[PDB]
Design a protein around this ligand. Structure first.
Ligand SMILES: [Cl-]
Ligand SMILES: [Mg+2]
Ligand SMILES: [Mn+2]
Ligand code: NA
Length: 192
DNA sequence: ACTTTAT
DNA sequence: ATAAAGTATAGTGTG
């Protein structure tokens, strides 16, 4: 079965709306809303925008103030096909998502992992994990998540997952498939 | 590459 | 004036 991993570039403007989904202030049921779990040691009340800025500001090497259009984090999505989460119990659910969080902690840094919101109230159990691209005193997604790196991630991470009792396969190498938005993909299934 | 941002 | 970092990527499926 296919291992699904995809980041989206997250700036201050769109971090408003991304935080506004990740915690609740219409494809969801409120009956399943609880039980959902956060996988970092972050303060529930504090927003991502405030957490990350201050984490960078205090840790950044250069004195040049943070640019307005900066990539503050990269909300990676970890999920798979529905046949995968069926053969998984409730405590193996936690074990699956924690190895995902770990891969990005082992290769890209521990306190870089700003959040890890797990959603069980949508169609598939999926984690929204936001990785801050802070390395060598620099904040750059351009330098951390480049062309070379995402090819490695698509190769290495599923093979890392297969070292932990889970049975997956990497997505089709050198794919030609273009990302369809949730609204687009829904419509892409309205006709067949 | 080429362009936008903060020195 | 300078220069690090913005744009993309890579992958699947009801994010
Ligand atoms: Cl649902
Ligand atoms: Mg047809
Ligand atoms: Mn969600
Ligand atoms: Na390609």
């Amino acid at each position: 079965s296919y291992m699904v991993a995809r980041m989206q570039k997250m700036k201050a403007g769109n971090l408003g709306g991304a935080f506004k989904h990740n915690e609740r202030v219409k494809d969801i049921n409120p009956s399943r809303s609880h039980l959902n779990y956060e996988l970092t040691d972050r303060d529930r009340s504090v927003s991502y925008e405030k957490q990350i800025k201050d984490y960078v500001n205090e840790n950044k090497v250069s004195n040049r103030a943070i640019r307005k259009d900066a990539v503050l984090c990269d909300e990676w999505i970890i999920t798979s096909d529905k046949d995968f989460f069926e053969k998984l119990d409730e405590e193996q659910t936690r074990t699956f998502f924690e190895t995902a969080k770990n891969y990005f902690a082992e290769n890209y840094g521990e306190s870089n992992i700003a959040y890890a919101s797990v959603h069980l109230d949508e169609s598939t159990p999926h984690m929204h994990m936001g990785v801050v691209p802070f390395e060598n005193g620099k904040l750059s997604s351009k330098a951390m998540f480049d062309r070379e790196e995402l090819k490695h991630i698509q190769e290495d991470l599923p093979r890392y997952m297969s070292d932990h009792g889970f049975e997956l396969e990497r997505g089709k190498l050198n794919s030609e498939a273009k990302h369809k938005t949730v609204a687009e993909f829904k419509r892409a299934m309205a006709d067949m």
